[PDB]
Amino acid sequence: VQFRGGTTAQHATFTGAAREITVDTDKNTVVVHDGATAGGFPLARHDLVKTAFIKADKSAVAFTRTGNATASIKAGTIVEVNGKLVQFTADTAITMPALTAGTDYAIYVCDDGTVRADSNFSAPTGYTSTTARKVGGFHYAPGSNAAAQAGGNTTAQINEYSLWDIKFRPAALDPRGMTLVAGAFWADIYLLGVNHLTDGTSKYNVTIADGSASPKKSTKFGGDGSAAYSDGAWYNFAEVMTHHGKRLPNYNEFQALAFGTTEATSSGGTDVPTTGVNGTGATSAWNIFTSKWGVVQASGCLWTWGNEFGGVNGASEYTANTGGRGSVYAQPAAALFGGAWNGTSLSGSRAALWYSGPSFSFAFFGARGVCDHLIL
Amino acid sequence: VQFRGGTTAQHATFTGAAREITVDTDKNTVVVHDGATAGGFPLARHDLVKTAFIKADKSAVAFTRTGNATASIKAGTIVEVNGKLVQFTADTAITMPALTAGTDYAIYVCDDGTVRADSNFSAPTGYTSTTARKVGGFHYAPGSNAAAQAGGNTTAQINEYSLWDIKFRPAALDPRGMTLVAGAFWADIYLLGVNHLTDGTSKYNVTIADGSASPKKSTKFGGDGSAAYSDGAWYNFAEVMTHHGKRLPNYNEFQALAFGTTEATSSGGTDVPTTGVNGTGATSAWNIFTSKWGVVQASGCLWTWGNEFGGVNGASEYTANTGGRGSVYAQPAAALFGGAWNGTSLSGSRAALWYSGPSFSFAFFGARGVCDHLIL
Amino acid sequence: VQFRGGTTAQHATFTGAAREITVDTDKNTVVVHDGATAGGFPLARHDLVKTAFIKADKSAVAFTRTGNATASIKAGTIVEVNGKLVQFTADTAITMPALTAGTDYAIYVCDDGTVRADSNFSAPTGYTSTTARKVGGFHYAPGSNAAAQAGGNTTAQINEYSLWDIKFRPAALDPRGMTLVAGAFWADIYLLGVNHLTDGTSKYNVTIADGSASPKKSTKFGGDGSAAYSDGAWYNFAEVMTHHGKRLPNYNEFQALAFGTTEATSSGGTDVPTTGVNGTGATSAWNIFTSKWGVVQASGCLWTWGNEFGGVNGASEYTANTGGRGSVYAQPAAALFGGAWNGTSLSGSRAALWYSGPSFSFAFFGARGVCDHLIL
Ligand SMILES: [Mg+2]
Ligand SMILES: [Mg+2]
């Protein structure tokens, strides 16, 4: 049984009858007619909505934290997956696996109509990347967010602001282990690791990069993949953030990301070698330094290099101190934020040092990444 | 009447005949056939195109200002609304309500085909938020944009540059009261007001937040809703902007946004308390200071905190002047731009003072929000 | 041959038998029925997927460089065009026109299903802009990208990093002549030219705008189209980049964009007047200074104004040197990056001079443009 239609050319001058239906054999699609309009009204093929993702409210993430280890996908969420339409007419709970503290999770909507979370970032368990479509994700943090200005506990839970969908996410290449600050931008939850190449910039429980344990050399910038930079200069940390589509914080970004940390306090001890854990001889616990947004070790554990210049200038005369890539002249200091483990009273969300030249390297100087917030 | 059916599983290994129409009982959709392809060619369900919005020219707003109190939606605009498709094949006038000077309006495309503007940002008069879709809006200014470099006048009219649509808008979380500057970025039309929590950062005829009468404390940073900040520190304004997903203008931004103001001229008198009105005992009228882009009181009224550090340094010794959030060493000044009522002939689009540290606070230091331009 | 359908009102409370097809005369669309659900299942009109563009991997450009003068469109690409659906199920070679060194090309997809490049940015030869759709583009460079840190050659070829599609492009208002740096942002390939108004900012083999040969006044800021600026001031270059929706680079950006250049080397000679060719009396070839991402004359040719302030301040009193647009107090120098031709061995990817005020101008002070990377 066949309905006669012709080419798109044929259809162009053809006017079907009110409620008549022809077939465009060029497009392979149905065309509805109204008995008055030349060409009719072609319908859309499904190939042209492949990957559609409609949220009821586009200005907020697609999910909700319902408990410490539970989350729901919001009502009104329409999702194309593997030729099929999956939609949720009411808030729907997301099936979780086991949740280890300090790990990242991806959220999948599957072609059977079920929504599941998983530690794997290609496909969840018992599905392929064709049967399941990754739509978002979250971080399962070691501790809670700062309920006020004292920090948070050490109850492992979902970081409410680490929730991202594919149209409400960090601008950077990989969205993992970042958190939405004030709904304005994204900050790395953890300070930059040494193995940022395999781990990402922001990972829980890894060696923190500093003047000594300097970061792996960026492969985008002539790094071989296991070699590290010879020092912990600003130049080096700035190079690393670029490689991951991020930048160092500015003052206004820092004072914001780190709010909620315990002010004018430091980790104490002789070192903070590891993200999310207590420092070597720490006189106060890591979670005392946890922002309102779940930025871990926000302040007073390690100075982060910044992306702003000013303060104390170097020699008013050309100096070749740039890892042998040119010379500086009257070179202003590159900001350092937060304080480190050993400035007791000095540390905090607005703590700022404008003395160090960008070529300076010390074991109190690391970095935290940021990037824009993109809503689509 | 009922057509040859089958499940997606069944459709998979089935080749229909040229112009045969089958129904996929799983997908609930029509499938066109060509007598050649396995599985045929499934059509798209309308849900997967919900909220669609297609512009003819994607790098321009969807509307044209046609006169002081009239504007039109451009030809080629296709809007999905409430299951319906509404489109404008020619330029169509937008139905205006009463327009009061210094008001923001929203533009709605209704399912009955009409396009109207209303002061209400949820639904126009005699429509539900289902039957009408908000697609953009504009600001009805209290005066003209600056034709030359002598400011504008006092004739209420649509600021042409203030037109935004859902895919051509300020990146900020709320589009109201902003104006697009040289198609590069968005700027607040008005200086930051005290009650920015209920008014947004930019609003006509409100009290201008300054060092004395400072801004309401930010909800997202531990404000309660009634509390003001203690003073008008750079730190505070910076934080108020971050709240609304805006930031302070940099030098390049400022010089762009303020262009068209009457250069080397100040308001005179003793104070500027209100946005969009004349200053207290002022010597030249407020519109003298309107920019090419409809930025009201662009210069020579209040200094605006910028987002750039440099110039005169504070003490070369840690100082706890950050409202109790850490200490600062050799802190460079936060830039201020524009000049103020007392500024005499120093005011203008490139007026810049690199003196005050971020901790300073005066009755002639305020702020203006800027943000990114979003084209989708 | 009619199908019994009615209005949307009517459809609202109606249930067809499983596989009954009706016509919504309001929406002019087909409605599938299941036997259970009221209102049925309205299908999507083609209008609502007009301009659709679907990549298999959204985080990468849609094309692949296959050799010096050949490229393919990636498998999985789906393009709506002129009411039709063109789609590439495997890597398909783009049809190349005649390739000339230092020219931008636009990649089109056409309703006859063919994919071709062309120097015309409206339509390829033998098509209207209705039958062909601009989807991407690239730069045919005068030399090669930097293999390591010695620069490149003079073999004309496709700069692989200059590939852009409509959902993977410079945020700038016009994507021509840019190249993506480490996947984080886009940088102009060429130093800003005098006739940027008609050439864009980044164009091969034109006069490089400097202090003597100042650029043309932006028509967005009072320029007429003929008039040049009186000097090569930071203020002016900054104005020019705003006009084109770009920024002056920052330090983190510059070290990135210029990486791969021959470090500690300058053009030598007396002057460098033209983009992409050797300087007047130069002692090193122009391609010696070609970056990893094919930034041409990246360093050691002209100081490029930066978008950072710090270093040497100026008169600690209100000076009016902003070309009549107000006064500056204790004005911090504007950064200058890369070094110039005279600079000798100071020049390089990190060469930075914080001495010159924003009002200074010299015949070795130019600019390069940058903008964000847009992914959709
Ligand atoms: Mg800056
Ligand atoms: Mg600075």
Phi, psi of C347 (to 5 degrees): -60, 150
Using CB atoms within 10 Å of the CB of residue A153, give its burial: 0 to 12 exposed, 13 to 18 middle, 19+ buried: middle
User: What are C2's two structure tokens?
Assistant: 């009619």
Ligand 1: centre distance to CA C358 (Å): 15
Number of CB atoms found within 10 A of residue B281's CB: 11
Number of CB atoms found within 10 A of residue B130's CB: 11
Tell me the C-alpha distance between B32 and B34, whole Å: 7
Query: Is B354 in the C-facing interface, judged by CB distances under 8 Å?
Result: yes
CA atoms within 13 A on the CB side of A19: 13
Nearest to A305 by CA among A367, A347, A363: A367
User: What are C39's two structure tokens?
Assistant: 């209102």
Tell me the C-alpha distance between C247 and C370, whole Å: 5
A48 secondary structure, DSSP code: G
Q: Which chains touch C (3 or more CB pairs under 8 A)?
A: A, B
Using CB atoms within 10 Å of the CB of residue A82, give its burial: 0 to 12 exposed, 13 to 18 middle, 19+ buried: middle
Buried b (16+ CB within 10 A) or exposed e, B250-267: bbbbbbbbbbbbbbbbbb
Ligand 2: centre distance to CA B309 (Å): 4
Q: Which chains touch B (3 or more CB pairs under 8 A)?
A: A, C
Buried b (16+ CB within 10 A) or exposed e, C164-185: bbbbbbbbbbbbbbbbbbbbbb
Helices (H), chain A: 8-13, 196-199, 234-243, 251-257
Residues in chain C: 376
Distance of CA C279 to the CA centre of its chain: 26
Query: Is C335 in the A-facing interface, judged by CB distances under 8 Å?
Result: yes
Which of A8, A32, A78 to mutate against chain C (most C CBs within 10 Å)? A32
Q: How far from B109 is each of A361, B4, B124, B267, CA to CA, in Å? A: 59, 39, 10, 42
Resolution in angstroms for this experimental structure? Answer: 3.2
CA atoms within 13 A on the CB side of C30: 34
Q: What is the DSSP string of A263-292?
A: TT----SSB--BTTSPPBT-SS-GGGGB-T
Using CB atoms within 10 Å of the CB of residue A355, give its burial: 0 to 12 exposed, 13 to 18 middle, 19+ buried: middle
Phi, psi of A76 (to 5 degrees): 85, 15
Tell me the C-alpha distance between B119 and A302, whole Å: 50
In the stretch 190-219 of chain B, residues with CB closer than 8 A to chain A read: none
Report how far apart the first and last C-alpha atoms of chain A are (Å, whole number): 44
- Residue in this structure with the two tokens 């045929």, named with its chain if needed: B40
Ligand 1: centre distance to CA A309 (Å): 7
Contacting residues for C317 by C-beta, under 8 A, at least 6 apart: C329
Give chain C as a 3 state SS string.
Answer: CECCCCCHHHHHCCCCCCCCEEEECCCCEEEECCCCCCCCEEECEHHHHCCCEECCCCCCCCEEEEECCEEEECCCCEEEECCEEEECCCCEECECCCCCCCEEEEEEEECCCCEEEECCCCCCCCCCCCCEEEEEEEEEECCCCCCCCCCCCCCCEECHHHCEECCEEECCCCCCCEEEECCCEEEECCCCECCHHHHCCCCCCCEECCCCCCCECCHHHCCCCCCECCCCCHHHHHHHHHHCCCECCCHHHHHHHCCCCCCCCCCCCCECCECCCCCECCCCCHHHHCCCCCCCCCCCECEEEEEEEEEEECCCCCECCCCCCCCEECCEEEEEECCEHHHHHHCCCCCEECCCCCCCCCCCEECCCEEEEEEC
Nearest to B329 by CA among A9, A351, A256, A239: A351
Number of CB atoms found within 10 A of residue A315's CB: 12
Phi, psi of C237 (to 5 degrees): -55, -40
Q: Are strands C365-366 and C303-313 parallel, antiparallel or unpaired?
A: parallel
Tell me the C-alpha distance between A36 and A14, whole Å: 10
Tell me the C-alpha distance between B144 and C225, whole Å: 25
* C-beta separation of B293 from B183 below 8 A: no
> Which amino acid would we find at residue C272?
V
Ligand 1: centre distance to CA A256 (Å): 16
Tell me the C-alpha distance between A350 and A338, whole Å: 6
Q: How far is A156 from chain B (nearest CA, A)?
A: 24
Using CB atoms within 10 Å of the CB of residue A6, give its burial: 0 to 12 exposed, 13 to 18 middle, 19+ buried: middle
List A280's β-bridge partners, or say none: A271
Element (H, E) at A303: strand A303-309
Q: With the CA atoms of A166, A169, A174 and A176 taken in that order, what torsion angle do they form, in degrees rounded to the nearest 10? A: -100
Query: Is A58 in the C-facing interface, judged by CB distances under 8 Å?
Result: no
**Looking at chain C, which residue has its C-alpha nearest residue A18?**
C2
Query: Is A80 in the B-facing interface, judged by CB distances under 8 Å?
Result: yes
Tell me the C-alpha distance between C128 and C115, whole Å: 14
Tell me the C-alpha distance between A332 and A314, whole Å: 6
Q: Are strands A303-309 and A178-181 parallel, antiparallel or unpaired?
A: unpaired
Phi, psi of B337 (to 5 degrees): -130, 150
Distance of CA B104 to the CA centre of its chain: 11
* C-beta separation of A368 from A301 below 8 A: no
Relative orientation angle of helices C234-243 and B251-258, to the nearest 10 degrees: 70
Which of B30, B252, B347 lies closest to C21 in CB terms? B30
Nearest to C246 by CA among C185, C289, C160: C185
Ligand 1: centre distance to CA C308 (Å): 5
Tally C-beta pairs within 8 A across B and C: 186
Phi, psi of A319 (to 5 degrees): -125, 125
User: What are C290's two structure tokens?
Assistant: 């070609």
Contacting residues for A346 by C-beta, under 8 A, at least 6 apart: A264, A266, A339, B318, B326, B327
User: What are C14's two structure tokens?
Assistant: 């109606």
Which of A20, A51, A316, A325 to mutate against chain C (most C CBs within 10 Å)? A325
Q: Is A327 helix (H, G, I), strand (E, B) or coil?
A: coil
Q: Is A191 helix (H, G, I), strand (E, B) or coil?
A: coil
A238 secondary structure, DSSP code: H
List B157's β-bridge partners, or say none: B141
Nearest to A339 by CA among B316, B327, B324, B238: B327
Q: How far from B197 is each of A65, A258, B174, B225, CA to CA, in Å? A: 26, 22, 12, 8
Phi, psi of A48 (to 5 degrees): -90, 5
* C-beta separation of A102 from A142 below 8 A: yes
Distance of CA A100 to the CA centre of its chain: 19
Tell me the C-alpha distance between C155 and C134, whole Å: 27
Query: Kindly report the CA angle at A95 between A90 and A98, in degrees rounded to 5?
Result: 155
Tell me the C-alpha distance between C145 and C257, whole Å: 12
A50 secondary structure, DSSP code: T
Chain B positions touching A85 (Cβ under 8 A) are 27, 45, 47-48
Flag if A29 and C49 touch (Cβ within 8 Å): no
- What domains are defined for chain B? 1-51 (2.10.10.30), 52-189+369-376 (2.80.20.10), 190-368 (3.90.1580.10)
* Rounded CA Rg of chain C: 26
Q: What is the DSSP string of A51-65?
A: T-EE-S-TTS-SEEE
Phi, psi of C120 (to 5 degrees): -85, 130
Tell me the C-alpha distance between C123 and C128, whole Å: 6
* C-beta separation of A15 from A32 below 8 A: no
Flag if A245 and C183 touch (Cβ within 8 Å): yes
Contacting residues for B87 by C-beta, under 8 A, at least 6 apart: B77, B78, B79, C47
| Largest Cα span, chain A | 87
Ligand 2: centre distance to CA C336 (Å): 13
Query: Is B2 in the A-facing interface, judged by CB distances under 8 Å?
Result: no
Flag if B85 and C19 touch (Cβ within 8 Å): no
Which of A34, A47, A322 lies closest to C78 in CB terms? A47
Nearest to C67 by CA among C88, C87, C94, C89: C94
* C-beta separation of A32 from A43 below 8 A: yes
Flag if C346 and A3 touch (Cβ within 8 Å): no
Contacting residues for A119 by C-beta, under 8 A, at least 6 apart: A97, A100, A103, A104, A105, A106
Collect residues with CB below 5 Å from ion ligand 2: A 309-310; B 309-310; C 309-310
Chain A positions touching B317 (Cβ under 8 A) are none
Tell me the C-alpha distance between A244 and A196, whole Å: 9
Tell me the C-alpha distance between A334 and A360, whole Å: 9
Tell me the C-alpha distance between B93 and B63, whole Å: 9
User: What are B329's two structure tokens?
Assistant: 């060493």
Flag if C25 and A48 touch (Cβ within 8 Å): no
User: What are B145's two structure tokens?
Assistant: 């944009």
- Residue in this structure with the two tokens 């190079």, named with its chain if needed: A239
Query: Is B85 in the C-facing interface, judged by CB distances under 8 Å?
Result: yes
Buried b (16+ CB within 10 A) or exposed e, A98-127: ebeebbbbbbbbbbeeebbbbeeeebbeeb
For chain A, how many helices (H) and strands (E)?
Answer: 4, 23
Q: How far is C226 from chain A (nearest CA, A)?
A: 37
User: What are B106's two structure tokens?
Assistant: 């929203």
Tell me the C-alpha distance between B204 and A130, whole Å: 53
**Looking at chain B, which residue has its C-alpha nearest residue C36?**
B28
User: What are C88's two structure tokens?
Assistant: 């590439």
Q: How far is B24 from chain C (nearest CA, A)?
A: 8
Flag if C346 and A326 touch (Cβ within 8 Å): yes
Which of C10, C20, C24, C43 to mutate against chain B (most B CBs within 10 Å)? C43
Contacting residues for A316 by C-beta, under 8 A, at least 6 apart: A329, A330, C312, C355
Tell me the C-alpha distance between A311 and A353, whole Å: 8
Give chain B as a 3 state SS string.
Answer: CCCCCCCHHHHHCCCCCCCCEEEECCCCEEEECCCCCCCCEEECEHHHHCCCEECCCCCCCCEEEEECCEEEECCCEEEEECCEEEEECCCEECECCCCCCCEEEEEEEECCCCEEEECCCCCCCCCCCCCEEEEEEEEEECCCCCCCCCCCCCCCEECHHHCEECCEEECCCCCCCEEEECCCEEEECCCCECCHHHHCCCCCCCEECCCCCCCECCHHHCCCCCCECCCCCHHHHHHHHHHCCCECCCHHHHHHHHCCCCCCCCCCCCECCECCCCCECCCCCHHHHCCCCCCCCCCCECEEEEEEEEEEECCCCCECCCCCCCCEECCEEEEEECCEHHHHHHCCCCCEECCCCCCCCCCCEECCCEEEEEEC
Buried b (16+ CB within 10 A) or exposed e, A166-186: bbbbbbbbbbbbbbbbbbbbb
User: What are B250's two structure tokens?
Assistant: 């940099």
Query: Is B358 in the A-facing interface, judged by CB distances under 8 Å?
Result: yes
User: What are A172's two structure tokens?
Assistant: 């950077």
User: What are C12's two structure tokens?
Assistant: 């609202």
Flag if A78 and B239 touch (Cβ within 8 Å): no
- Residue in this structure with the two tokens 């202003």, named with its chain if needed: A332
Q: How far is B45 from chain A (nearest CA, A)?
A: 8
Tell me the C-alpha distance between C278 and C154, whole Å: 12
Which of C166, C350, C370 to mutate against chain A (most A CBs within 10 Å)? C350
In the stretch 269-328 of chain B, residues with CB closer than 8 A to chain A read: 307-311, 313, 316, 318, 320, 322-328
User: What are B33's two structure tokens?
Assistant: 């056939």
Q: With the CA atoms of A234, A235, A239 and A245 taken in that order, what torsion angle do they form, in degrees rounded to the nearest 10? A: 50
Contacting residues for B356 by C-beta, under 8 A, at least 6 apart: B234, B333, B334, B336, B362, B365
CA dihedral (B196, B199, B205, B207) positive or negative: negative
Ligand nearest to the Cα of B334, by number: 2
Phi, psi of A96 (to 5 degrees): -100, 155
Flag if C44 and A49 touch (Cβ within 8 Å): yes
* C-beta separation of A33 from A17 below 8 A: yes
Distance of CA B136 to the CA centre of its chain: 11
User: What are A10's two structure tokens?
Assistant: 């044929």
Tell me the C-alpha distance between A211 and B51, whole Å: 51
* C-beta separation of C99 from C140 below 8 A: yes
Q: Are strands B365-366 and B21-24 parallel, antiparallel or unpaired?
A: unpaired
* Rounded CA Rg of chain A: 26
* C-beta separation of B177 from B293 below 8 A: no
A183 secondary structure, DSSP code: T
* C-beta separation of B281 from B366 below 8 A: no
- Residue in this structure with the two tokens 């009502």, named with its chain if needed: A75
Tell me the C-alpha distance between B115 and B123, whole Å: 12
Nearest to A351 by CA among A282, A284, A261: A261
Which of A3, A182, A252 lies closest to B21 in CB terms? A3
Tell me the C-alpha distance between A5 and A57, whole Å: 41
Tell me the C-alpha distance between C268 and C281, whole Å: 7
